[PDB]
Amino acid sequence: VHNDVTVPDFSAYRREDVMDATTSSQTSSEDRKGFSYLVTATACVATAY
């Protein structure tokens, strides 16, 4: 039955800032997104050059 279904554990992959299941992942969101988008933004700058 669908009640016996659990999402597995993703700690081996989770970003250090969202590893703790009892902390609002939201606070670290702006950074997680800020960082990745920075990489991209930089890549664009390079290509642009």
Partner 1 sequence: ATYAQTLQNIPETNVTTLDNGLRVASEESSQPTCTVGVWIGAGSRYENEKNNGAGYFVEHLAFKGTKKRPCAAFEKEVESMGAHFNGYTSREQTAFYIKALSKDMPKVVELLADVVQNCALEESQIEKERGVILQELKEMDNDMTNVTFDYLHATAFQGTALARTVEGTTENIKHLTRADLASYIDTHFKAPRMVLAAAGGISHKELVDAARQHFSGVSFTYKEDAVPILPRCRFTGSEIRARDDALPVAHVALAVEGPGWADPDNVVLHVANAIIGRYDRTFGGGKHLSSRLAALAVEHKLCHSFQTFNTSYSDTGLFGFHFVADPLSIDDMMFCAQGEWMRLCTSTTESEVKRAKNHLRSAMVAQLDGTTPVCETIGSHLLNYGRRISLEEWDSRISAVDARMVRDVCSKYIYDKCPALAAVGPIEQLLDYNRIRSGMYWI
Partner 2 sequence: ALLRQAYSALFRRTSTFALTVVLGAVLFERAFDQGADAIFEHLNEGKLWKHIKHKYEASEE
Ligand X SMILES: CCCCCCCC/C=C\CCCCCCCC(=O)OC[C@H](COP(=O)(O)OCCN)OC(=O)CCCCCCC/C=C\CCCCCCCC
List contacts with ligand X (CB under 6 A): 37, 40, 43-44, 47-48
What is the CA 6 to chain-centroid distance, rounded? 20
Tell me which of ligand X, partner 2, partner 1, none is bound by residue 1, counting a contact when its beta carbon lies within the kind-specific cut-off of 5 to 8 angstroms. Answer: partner 1
Q: Which token pair is 41?
A: 């933004």
Question: Collapsing DSSP states into helix, strand and coil, what is residue 7?
Answer: coil
Interacting residue ranges for partner 1, rule: CB under 8 A: 1-7, 9-10, 18, 20-26, 29, 33
What whole-number distance in Å separates Cα of residue 44 and Cα of residue 1? 48
| Interaction site with partner 2 (CB under 8 A) | 30-31, 33-35, 37-38, 41-42, 44-46, 48-49
